[model samples]
Target: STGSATTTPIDSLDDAYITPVQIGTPAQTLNLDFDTGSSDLWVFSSETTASEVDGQTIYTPSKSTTAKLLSGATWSISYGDGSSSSGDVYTDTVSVGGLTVTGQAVESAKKVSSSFTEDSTIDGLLGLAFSTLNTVSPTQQKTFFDNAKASLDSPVFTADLGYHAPGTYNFGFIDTTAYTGSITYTAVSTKQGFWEWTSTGYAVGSGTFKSTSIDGIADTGTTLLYLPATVVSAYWAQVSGAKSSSSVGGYVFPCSATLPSFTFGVGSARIVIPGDYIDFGPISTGSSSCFGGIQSSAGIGINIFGDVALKAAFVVFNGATTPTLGFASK
Candidate 1:
């Protein structure tokens, strides 16, 4: 009842892990981003605007004998960062790591954003979030995990997301080999279609831990770690020559500057982020200018523990009746 797949990097840090999945009778494989932030298995298809597609392979339903049009059903989705996709829906058998689920909703995009078109590697999005977040007209569709959960020995999945390296996602059961030491479990709030959790507090560099509790979501799709403006400013204060770039926005520091490790509270336990992980490479080609992996979620409503934070731990999305997140040092 368990399934697993090897995830390869496309970027490195913010660069997400893509899972290869098969659709239809003939089994057309698509490399989709395994995003825990959103729910909707969407792919580029023949129905998509030809000119808009760059180098992505399109899914043609007509070729698959098992593919059936879910008449009257359609889907359109957009992300906080402006990446979007919209199109019709079809029910097909989807295979992931050899396990097959029949009557799975497969959305084919007719339109995609430039951010998607430019990133040719990500064929589509295989959402791992709660089923309630699904975006389909008339009625919502269950995510790949949701439809397959009943058959699973344990309705759980673990994400061993790597930093600039290979990682793996395990479904149905926890792979004890992926994590070490004791796993800390914390309650997750699904009231907002997200894996929301509250941290006891955080630390900047080697500073003393604070008593402040931060509320945020463990969003695998998002690239950077987002916190309150006040916290972001405090972290930046420790970095020499670091400032919020007016034109680019967020905090940017000199490439040569060394950074301090960031710490996020997990209830009473604390997961300390290595200092090097804070410097999220460069904004552009020039190494002289670099951006901090952490930024202020000024406009956003909730704090996001994106790749910057998740990469530091092996997370288990324990999706039982009372779902919770289990985190352990990788």
Candidate 2:
């Protein structure tokens, strides 16, 4: 049988987005950012008086019929962009997509910064990513996966980002029919919570970039795929009449012409990114259109493979059966 499914659109805060989940027996709904970058569930609170926490959604445990605090426990998170938030710990029953899980760990923030407060439309973040990166110490913490795994038949999870095209994100069981073969699996590293690896190299428009092979990391927290400037420049060189333009506060291209396909070597696997990704809308600031494959990062961190790369393949993150990362055709 052909496996098929549908998705419901969730609200987004800036680029960070999430679907609504109800917590507690009486069911108080809270919007959450389903982040893969961090494995912690946290929410802003109406009790917080921090000025930086304005405009973002805040959950009121006092208002919930089934909310309970984890006496003396606390939580905090700092992002790569220098944004941070912290709060007390709590536990409650949570529900997502009609699936209910009880006694989930959650954080109630008392302090928040402008970067998180101003940009976030959702009040909280639900980390369905992995347990390795979980902020809630293993001994004391529980993740969304920890709760959901027991209920799922296959004990498998899949992230469908292109469900409604471009920005829609879907989470749940893996659909095997999307791919041709069994998944190529990799073990999850315990050191960090993120799924990471080293890139063998990159190819653009049939020509291989000299330094295409390099260490890289894949993160769902990041919105854009970041590559070294040298690698990006070489790939951009292949586009016919591809000029750089600054729009949407980033480099973009004006033309709809088909560009060459680019591939990134991930150990023994070769993952290809299609040409349509190279076709981007023009940026407002720059004169010429910018190539979509690469952009300037002003020196932040290591090269990252974000949703742009993830949308191309079917990824199976199995934390219940074993600590492993599996990939297949989608």
Candidate 3:
């Protein structure tokens, strides 16, 4: 059997992109966030209380002929944003695009925090992080991709995220047609269970690149790019009318300011984030105030190369060797 799948972005808000995946025997299809920041395949299911469900579609294991309970196994997870969920486990056939993996652990949520319940559009999160980070009790579970990797033509996946446009996530193959220019490769350190790497330094638009090294992770689930406060402060210093407002939070500036691009070094290659991308969105409805996308990762510890950064490049998560990441302009 062929081991390849493709996912296209659903039309919705540009903050987070979702794709469709089928779970269980009867094939209960649900829209899910493919997150590389964590590891666990959880969903809003029949176990979830009706009041907490809102308009979300659920996975009912009893309705699926192939569903199997994993005895007393249970799982719970809390995200960096403070949202959390706990549920029981079921082994079922899970399918993404055209790839199917049998006996994949699918946690059915029984208790979800208000933060998660309010995100009505997100039925669940399909984590792409290493299996070592899986939260299941007694026995850790393997992710769908981990199970399917053995059968794949290549142990790799491509994340091609575009702004307000349909992006593609391709598994098992690198479609040269999706990206342009040479792919610059960087070594990844997975000791922290993340696709992390160190950048040589960064600089503001038209400024000389510095040589301060920093460590960070590539997180698909996170929406904004976060860096050191000193660096963030320096970038906004160049923009007129930019200030750190308590009410607006982070750094805020006039919507019409002529902004400059932020550049960072990966090996010898320079990756530039356009000025407009850092503008984020308006602070309030019908307001001229806009919050800066790049903020301090102070309390957060490590910096996050979130969607804002990933969307600017075509990313290849290569697991075949030393878990390297290859990036190129899209």
Best by TM-score: 1
Regions more than 4 Å wrong, model 1:
12-14
Tell me the tens digit of each residue's lDDT in model 1 across 164-235.
Answer: 787888889887887778789998999999999888888998899987978899988887899999889888
RMSD of 1: 1.2
Cα displacement (angstroms), candidate 2, residue 165, comes to: 2.7
After best superposition, candidate 2 residue 210: deviation in angstroms? 7.8
lDDT of 2 at 146: 68
Candidate 1's displacement at residue 100, Å, is 1.8
Question: Residue by residue across 1-330, what tens digits does model 3's lDDT show?
Answer: 233344444433357777789998789998888898899999999999778887778899999999999999999999988899999999999988787889999999998888778777788999988888999999999987788888888898888887767687777888899878878889899999898988778999899998888788888888888999898888999999999887766899898897898887778877788887787767887789888878888979899988878888888888776798888886
**Which 10 residues in a row give candidate 1 its minimum summed lDDT?**
8-17
Cand. 2 TM to true fold = 0.77
Better of 2 and 3 by lDDT: 3
Q: How accurate locally, in lDDT, is each candidate?
A: 0.88, 0.63, 0.84
Error of 1 at 319 (Å): 0.9
RMSD of each: 1.2, 4.6, 1.8
